[PDB]
Amino acid sequence: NNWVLLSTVAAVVLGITTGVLVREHSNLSTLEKFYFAFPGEILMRMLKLIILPLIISSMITGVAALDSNVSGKIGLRAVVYYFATTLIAVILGIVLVVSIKPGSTVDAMLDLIRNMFPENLVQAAFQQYKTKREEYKIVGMYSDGINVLGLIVFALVFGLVIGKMGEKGQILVDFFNALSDATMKIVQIIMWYMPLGILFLIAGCIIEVEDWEIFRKLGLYMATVLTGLAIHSIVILPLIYFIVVRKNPFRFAMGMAQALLTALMISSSSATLPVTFRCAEENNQVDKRITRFVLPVGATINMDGTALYEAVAAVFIAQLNDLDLGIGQIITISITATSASIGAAGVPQAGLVTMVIVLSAVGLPAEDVTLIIAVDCLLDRFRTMVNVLGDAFGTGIVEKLSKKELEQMD
Amino acid sequence: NNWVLLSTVAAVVLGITTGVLVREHSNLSTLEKFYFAFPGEILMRMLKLIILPLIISSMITGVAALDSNVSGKIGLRAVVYYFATTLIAVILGIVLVVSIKPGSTVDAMLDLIRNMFPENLVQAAFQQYKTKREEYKIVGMYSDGINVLGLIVFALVFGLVIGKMGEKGQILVDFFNALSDATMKIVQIIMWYMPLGILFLIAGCIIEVEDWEIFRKLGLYMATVLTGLAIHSIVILPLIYFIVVRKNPFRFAMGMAQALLTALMISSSSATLPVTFRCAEENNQVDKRITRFVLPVGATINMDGTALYEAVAAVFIAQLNDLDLGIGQIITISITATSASIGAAGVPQAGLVTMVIVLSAVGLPAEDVTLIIAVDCLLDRFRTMVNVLGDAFGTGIVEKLSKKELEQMD
Amino acid sequence: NNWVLLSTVAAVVLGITTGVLVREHSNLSTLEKFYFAFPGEILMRMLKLIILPLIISSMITGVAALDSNVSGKIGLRAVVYYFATTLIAVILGIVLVVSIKPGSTVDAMLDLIRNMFPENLVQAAFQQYKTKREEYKIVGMYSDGINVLGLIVFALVFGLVIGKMGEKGQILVDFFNALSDATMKIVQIIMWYMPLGILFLIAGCIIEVEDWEIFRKLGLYMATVLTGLAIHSIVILPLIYFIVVRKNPFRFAMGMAQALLTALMISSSSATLPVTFRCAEENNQVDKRITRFVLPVGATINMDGTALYEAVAAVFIAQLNDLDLGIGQIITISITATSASIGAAGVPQAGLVTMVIVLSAVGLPAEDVTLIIAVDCLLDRFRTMVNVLGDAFGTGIVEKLSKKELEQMD
């Protein structure tokens, strides 16, 4: 049976009830509040532990599985699809935030390019590079935080090289195939424990809210973000799927419902990858090669949810201050916020350090994060859900458009 | 011939003579004293270098060698045996320190649980996590020091997964078998050079003592620690072995004498692992699978020596201050000190950072370490000797109790 | 065709022209000067990224390819040749700097020995150990910077062990062979992009010079360094080659011209390794085993260029100050400067941190580096060229002297 998903839904409702009841009838200190959310912290720690080998081995295996003379077209189609979806999401978010009205960059882009080619493979696993101008000379240094962008680029190049090697790279191909399978099984073992961590995480999230008037004050900001995400998930993506693939998009969404729920629950596209693989390969008759190549790329560089969430939050923050913007300032903020997070799109994010960096770069005060940090728990899950839905639709579209390429391999 | 052990014994006696003669007839500055112990520092550095791959590959290989439907009972028996021995050692140490009379915790336990599941596999190889309460909110950060506990847990889970994989994980199994053999050979190469390092280490240890009245002042503390270790090694462990295995325990100890001497000399259970393997498999007719699985686990979570040494030292320090304790305070100190070192029990320890953390947590002053740091050289070697003796007895007991399981594999 | 080398030469001349024209006709701020050299920084970053796996896998593969009973003599001959060449270079540099007249150590040597045996394999990939005396007690700590010396020693020991293992180490041998080939191919991919980075690097180097009288002031220092390098490359090395191998040394140099140009262009002996392999194995009929073993060792511990460059620069700096030296002080400075860089001789060096450490140790002021940092761009390339020429001549000499050993393998 599907005991994991039912248990997780029961844990979610029980955690909501527990948080509400404890907040209403019990008074706890800050230390007790921190101690009440320990299982959720343990679950988040376990989820973080498995991100590196899973994504690295999946990328290498997916790239190496394709023929040398074929992978270029598939990759080109994937990047074109993701760029188009990100542009549409950016436009929709800008239009919605302008209409509803709810309420340094060069260094950031150069750092983004710098992180694509790290100076140390081992150091990139837990550290990132950043520069700042001081009196003017540029000074750079390394700070904690996994450099997923550089590891993904190196993994892609390495997978291409060992796929083109042939008989001399077969041992590496087999090694990374076995590593990918082992990481998948370990992820399943962690999924076994997930529900209790989710229960306590929801209870702690609800308990941490103290004012209870922040939700009332944050009117039309939740409405704006939710409306943008709903429009993107329900209208634009199914229309693109039907236009390219002459098939019903909602049967496709019905097949992926299990992965959609899982992603909505753990809020981690990279973690959900095994369920997405299974749903896309079994429930829908999508080729294994296309799925295994496209899905990690989507979990890495999908920016529709970021464009519909962080960009809107930034424009709302700028609107809170009497800092009336122009068309250029709004477009610059949306571009900076969307581009600054291109590296880490699958890892779980709670502190929104990328958006803090964006706020610092665009000159806005960095102390306004607290006014929206309370509702991040609710919004991030829907962001991840729409991200994985877009990834699945992209796998379907690329499989549709790669008929000749998949014919040559046979 | 056995030229390594005879050479090491000759080096030990020559180092004792050299240290005594240099202290008596020569006067050296602090810088010259530091320069006199350089070869011992080099030997310790080389021993530290080989701890990670050896323990990781040994754990993976030992776990993967067992059948999937069998390893649960073997692991359960091993943990039960180690828990029982640790409890007996704790009780004996408490009783002895109370009778002879020679002279924050929640955060520590939560950190112990946190380190079982690190957030980064690469970072866990050289860094550890720690939290502290400040004005109250909890703040955590990473500090230098290998996280053996997390690596051991991940290695166990990975070994189980790849053992259950079968034909798809055979390549990883072969890879880690070869890695384990290579690490063993490198350890043997280091053992070739060991004796000169031991000579200079003993000479430097003896030279560093300056007062020469600290030994007289530290009366009944050496007596207490040595009596506890001797009682545990000579009475309790052989009695348990004879009760479970109806055989003479001293022939077993006679067979393991080579590994016992080696462990007494280098004071590193993990380093002694190859000699322990050879003695337990050849001198005693113990099954290879049981040995290869139990011995790394013992080298990792054996706490009898820690309970008989650090706990007693802590109670002695608390007795030095006019800080008359109760039964609860003594039991809390013994439990905290024993549990805080569960991660690093095989690596060489000289600075006793774990006991410093324990003293900080139990509210005792941290400046009293110097009064006992002088005799650590002598006591740590006997602690390691009794630890490896307990590990060997545990291998024998588990092999005795696993007759049906070892019958199914055949 | 040879489009890469011709494109790189055209890029070099175009970068020289661009730098001269921009300096003469345009005025730029410091920030614009930094932004003008971004592609060169990206190229240097990519070159740095590939140094670790390439050198590690090449060392392991080269050591493991040789028979167990043979590799000792080959290694002995290689070390003897490198020691003799370094001694001759030291003598020549000292004599030239004394005649032309253009213008703490114990801790350094002990740190050099300490870095040969690191305490952590993972930490050695990006960190180094250093000690300092303070009031006297010695305090050590770790700082950023790859520890190539320790990794090379561990790789050599590991390669010997797995070569002696045989059928049980064949899987590791195959794994590292495949890894070496993959790293070579990735290096070739980077070489594809190299020329534009070289163009912008030369343009930025030329632009950064502002006084334009520093070249006139630095008279007889360029002359001394260039004369020493030219004498070493043209006279001493061909004479040694002809004395040992009764063959024309200039046909050998003509065969290696492609690798010589490449090394002169990128100034990185380790990066040039694939071209050196191809030229030495195809253009000259040198045995593959001798080449694959000797060349990484030369790229790691070749000190002729360092002895002819850093030692002379240090003596020139000491001559600038009215600090008249003796024979012992000059020999101590040359020995310290040559020995302090034994670890990193193949990686690209621009900041000359090793020479800064040498200046700090020998008591000379550390602020005089700026007076010679301007001409480092020009001199380092010739230093690397003579280093790779010496490495190739060493491969030839060792192949000549290893006739019996290469006969036994057949």
Residue numbers in the entry:
A (entry chain B), B (entry chain C), C (entry chain A): 17 to 119, 137 to 168, 200 to 474
Extract from the study:
Human excitatory amino acid transporters (EAATs) concentrate the neurotransmitter glutamate and aspartate in cells. By coupling the uptake of one substrate molecule to movements of five ions—symport of three sodium (Na+) ions and a proton and countertransport of one potassium (K+) ion—EAATs ensure that the cytoplasmic glutamate concentration is ~10 mM, which is required for neuronal functions, while the extracellular concentrations are as low as a few nM permitting rounds of synaptic signaling. EAATs are homotrimers composed of promoters that work independently. TMs 1, 2, 4, and 5 of each protomer comprise the scaffold domain mediating trimerization; TMs 3, 6, 7, and 8 and helical hairpins (HPs) 1 and 2 form the substrate-binding transport domain.
iOFS-K+ and iOFS-Apo imaged in the KCl and alkali-free NMDG buffers, respectively, have similar structures and feature well-resolved HP2s closed over the substrate-binding sites, although the hairpin conformations differ. What are the structural correlates distinguishing translocation-competent and translocation-incompetent states? iOFS-Apo is structurally similar to iOFS-K+ (RMSD of 0.52 Å for the transport domains); both feature apo configurations of the NMD and YE/DDR motifs. However, in translocation-incompetent iOFS-Apo and iOFS-Na+, HP2 residues coordinating K+ and Na2 and residues 414–417 at the start of the HP2b helix unwind and form an enlarged loop with an opening in the middle (states highlighted in pink), resembling an unzipped purse. The potassium binding to iOFS-Apo and glutamate to iOFS-Na+ zip HP2s, increasing their helicity and decreasing dynamics, as evidenced by the better-defined HP2 EM density of iOFS-K+ compared to iOFS-Apo. In contrast, deprotonated E374 of apo EAAT3 is engaged with R447 and cannot stabilize the helix, necessitating K+ binding to zip the hairpin. Comparing iOFS-Na+ to iOFS-Apo structures, we observed that sodium binding led to M367 in the NMD motif shifting into the binding pocket and R447 in the YE/DDR motif shifting out. Thus, in contrast to iOFS-Na+, iOFS-Apo cannot bind and translocate glutamate, preventing the dissipation of the glutamate gradient. In iOFS-Apo and iOFS-Na+, E374 is solvent-accessible through the unzipped HP2 and likely deprotonated with pKa-s of 6.5 and 7.1, respectively.
